[PDB]
Amino acid sequence: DEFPEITEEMEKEIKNVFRNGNQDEVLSEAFRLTITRKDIQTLNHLNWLNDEIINFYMNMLMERSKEKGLPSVHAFNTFFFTKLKTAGYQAVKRWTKKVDVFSVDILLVPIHLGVHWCLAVVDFRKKNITYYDSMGGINNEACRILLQYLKQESIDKKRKEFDTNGWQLFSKKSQEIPQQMNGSDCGMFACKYADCITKDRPINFTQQHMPYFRKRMVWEILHRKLL
Amino acid sequence: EFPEITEEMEKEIKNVFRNGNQDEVLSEAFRLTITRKDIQTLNHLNWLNDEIINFYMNMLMERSKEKGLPSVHAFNTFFFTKLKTAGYQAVKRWTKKVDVFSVDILLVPIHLGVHWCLAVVDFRKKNITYYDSMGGINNEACRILLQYLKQEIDKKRKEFDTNGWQLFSKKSQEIPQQMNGSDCGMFACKYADCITKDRPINFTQQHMPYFRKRMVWEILHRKLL
């Protein structure tokens, strides 16, 4: 335990933005994104997160990754995977215009499967590609789709072969990682998995920590500051 | 009792499992098409794909034509998922020719990533019920459907009277749990079988292998046992 606490004063800030008012009010703005009162509300109660929250959060992990001791990180926008599974390399090879995906330690790939979120992660240090689902599901397919994409990107941006030597692809089973009870927490699980993983910290929390993680993320998002 | 697959039936079942012509059309009904590859999804370590579940749900729909049995409407498997992600807007063109309220029961297969659950509106028992088989919670679904009925105005220019209708993700005890995830679709399909007949959910994980064999047979013959 010893999760950073949310002081009373922090709580007032949180309560305030869960209130009603200008639903368009830009609560925070960064990385080409825009979190409004409306997006922020998707964190309330037991509401489903929306893509804006997820992408904004993933970008904070990415910004945090700029410090040392820590593994450098690129985070793909959430639309990336689905525009890859359903339309292939061609539709998304553009998005990495100006990005050397091979120059970082870790890639985050939020995976939107219907109403559900999961996450895949390319860690180059370990030389492996891993899939995380807070519901137990496994999805070697998605890891192979990322290998293919990786393969095809090496050629394209690098004119070189992608070396799969030692490279392992796989899913983590329900006992390896805390599981959800509320379907709506799936997005929180994905964001929180990436938080530990990008700090190279063990995934320590469980489902009971979710009400608090939602409250905290509102806060973090609003200050563009991770605790 | 469970209804027996005789060796004669088991022999028909053995036949559809072979290498080659995976795109071969084996059964075909309710504008759906079930191929060898679809049918393989009923083998022991496999997850039922959507075409299987949609076909079975449509068989429960036809069965429901039988007198004495409650009238039943089953939504396709992409339905609930689109009602959520894209809102009522993207699903009301789906019942253009169906009058929902003219039936005892609505079946809504919920696909949640890889998992399958099931929601039931019994119009003649006034409530929605949600059966997950993996001990799971999703209470929204249950209101989104009360929401959905109210919104399906779009059909007969009347608000829908929603007096004391209830929403609950059904307990583990209360219903047989899986042991194998791969069987989640069967659980939804078979919860569903039980409900549409009115008889209680009287089976366990132990019966799942049999239930797969039997469903291959049921789908090949468009005949429920």
Spell out the domain ranges in chain B. 1-225
Report the C-alpha gap between B21 and B127 in whole angstroms.
45
**Whole-angstrom Cα distance, residue A121 to residue A129?**
6
Q: Are B121 and B128 in contact (CB under 8 A)?
A: yes
**A182 in reach of chain B (CB within 8 A):** yes
Contacts of B81 in chain A (CB under 8 A): 114-115
CA–CA distances in Å: residue B159 to residues A23, B75, B106: 28, 22, 19
A98 to chain B, any CB pair closer than 8 A? The answer is no
Cβ within 8 Å of residue B149, ≥6 positions away: B100, B121, B160, B162
Closest CA to A74 of A46, A95, A89: A95
Strands A33-36 and A73-75: unpaired
Contact criterion met (CB below 8 Å) for B185 and B48: yes
Beta bridge partners of B129: B120, B168
SS3 content of chain A, % helix, strand, coil (to 5): 40, 15, 40
What is the distance between the terminal CA atoms of chain A, rounded to a whole angstrom?
Answer: 14
CB-CB neighbors (< 8 A) of B138 in chain A: 182-184
Cβ-based neighbour number of residue B152 at 10 Å: 19
The pair of structure tokens assigned to B221 is 């013959």
Cα A40 from Cα A36, distance rounded (Å): 6
Structure tokens at A56: 């904004």
From chain B, the residues in CB contact with A181 under 8 A are: 135-137
Nearest to A115 among B81, B135, B137 (CB): B81
Number of helices (H), then strands (E), belonging to chain A: the values are 7, 7
Fold classification of A1-227 is Adenoviral Proteinase; Chain (3.40.395)
Distance CA A111, CA A187 (A): 10
B132 labelled catalytic: yes
SS3 (DSSP) at A168? strand
Q: Is B99 labeled as catalytic in the residue annotation?
A: no
Please give the CATH topology (third level) of the domain spanning B1-225.
Adenoviral Proteinase; Chain (3.40.395)
Could A181 and B137 be called an inter-chain contact, meaning their C-beta atoms sit closer than 8 Å?
Answer: yes
Query: Which of chain B's residues have a Cβ under 8 Å away from the Cβ of A46?
Result: 139-140
Structure tokens at A148: 């293919």
Which residue is closest to B78 within chain A, CA to CA? A114
Which one of A48, A114, A133 has the shortest CB-CB distance to B111?
A: A114
Query: Within 13 Å of residue A65, how many CA atoms lie on the same side as its CB?
Result: 23
Amino acid at B63: R
- Pairing of β A73-75 and β A106-113: parallel
Distance CA B123, CA B132 (A): 21
Put simply, the answer to whether A114 touches B85 (Cβ < 8 Å) is yes
Q: Which residues of B touch A208 (CB under 8 A)?
A: none
Cβ proximity of B34 and B219 under 8 Å: yes
CA distance B101 to B106: 9
| C-beta atoms of B138 and A114 within 8 A | no
Where helices occur in chain B by DSSP H, the ranges are 7-15, 36-40, 50-63, 78-86, 139-151, 184-197, 208-221
**B137 — contact with chain A (CB < 8 Å)?**
yes
DSSP A18-65: HS-S-TT-EEEEETTEEEEHHHHHTTSTTPPP-HHHHHHHHHHHHHHT
Is B202 an interface residue toward A (CB < 8 Å)? Answer: no
Say if residue A226 is exposed, middle or buried (CB neighbours under 10 Å; 0-12, 13-18, 19+): middle
Instruction: Note whether A114 contacts B181, CB cutoff 8 Å.
Output: no
User: From residue A107, how far is each of A60, A81, A170, A171, B43 by CA, in Å?
Assistant: 14, 12, 15, 16, 36
CB contact under 8 A, B140 and A113: no
Q: Specify the 3-state DSSP secondary structure of B45.
A: coil
**Catalytic residue from among B38, B184, B189, B193:** B184
Q: Do B136 and A183 touch (CB under 8 A)?
A: yes
Query: Per residue in B58-92, is it b (16+ CB within 10 Å) or e — as a string?
Result: bbbbeebeeeeebebbbbbbbbbbbbbeeebeebb
Residue type, A29: E
Crossing angle for the helix pair B7-15 and B208-221, to the nearest 10 degrees: 80
Question: Environment class of residue A199 by beta-carbon count within 10 Å: exposed (0-12), middle (13-18) or buried (19+)?
Answer: middle
CA atoms within 13 A on the CB side of B143: 5
Residue with tokens 């993207």: B90
Determination technique used: X-ray
Active-site residues of A, by number, are 116, 133, 186
Check if the beta carbon of residue B141 is closer than 8 Å to that of residue B106.
Answer: no
| CA A195 – CA A156 distance, rounded (Å) | 30
Tokens at residue B35, please?
């191929």
Q: Which residue has the tokens 């799969």?
A: A164
Instruction: Give the helix/strand (H/E) hosting B19.
Output: none
Closest among A106, A132, A101 to A198, alpha carbons compared: A106
Task: Lay out the sheet containing A106-113: strands in order across.
Answer: A73-75, A106-113, A116-123, A128-132, A168-171
Return the amino acid letter for A151: K
B3, two tokens: 């209804």
